[PDB]
């Protein structure tokens, strides 16, 4: 009869999940709901652009500060090219994943029901053309993010503690 913070998934005890503060806190749930992957109404291309931008931007750093040429004068260029190559490989990964997973002309099988039960429209990211647009946007955004990180770090040479 106590408070009992922990609850079953949407009140259903026979679904394989739980309601924890980590899962569905108002702050955590708000944060996850507004991530580009979970903005179902937005076109897949723009979500892919945002995801690729973020991922290339964060990927530039490790290659630059850990690559084999980190002690040379081409450290920045080598790291940026390594990040771009990883982005390209992941673009091939996304393309083949979409080819294998989705077939042209089929409806989306993503969950179209909210926790409350609003029964919204199915997400178009889980479609052949949706995933193709997502992959193209991710490629463009990844290259853009790598270029932006290289420009900020080296072409413009903003003052940063570690680089």
């Amino acid at each position: 009869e106590k408070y009992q913070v922990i609850e079953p998934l949407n009140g259903d005890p026979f679904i394989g999940g739980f309601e924890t503060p980590v899962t569905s806190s108002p702050l955590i749930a708000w944060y996850l709901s507004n991530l580009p992957a979970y903005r179902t109404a937005v076109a897949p291309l723009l979500r892919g652009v945002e995801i690729g931008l973020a991922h290339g931007y964060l990927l530039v750093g490790p290659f630059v500060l850990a690559g084999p040429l980190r002690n040379s004068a081409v450290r920045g260029e080598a790291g940026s090219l390594a990040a771009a190559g990883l982005v390209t490989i992941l673009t091939m990964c996304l393309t083949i994943y979409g080819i294998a997973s989705f077939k042209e002309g089929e409806a989306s099988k993503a969950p179209s029901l909210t926790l409350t039960g609003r029964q919204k429209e199915a997400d178009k990211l889980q479609t052949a053309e949706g995933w193709a647009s997502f992959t193209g946007g991710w490629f463009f955004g990844g290259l853009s993010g790598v270029a932006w990180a290289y420009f900020l770090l080296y072409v413009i040479n903003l003052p940063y503690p570690v680089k």
Partner: peptide, 26 residues
């Protein structure tokens, strides 16, 4: 109904019955 009582099985609402929910799909 899914939420009228302690029943959690409903053929009219199979997505609710099987747990096919979208937790963070804004």
């Amino acid at each position: 109904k899914y939420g009228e009582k302690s029943v959690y099985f409903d053929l009219g609402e199979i997505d609710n019955t099987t747990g096919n929910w979208d937790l963070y799909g804004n």
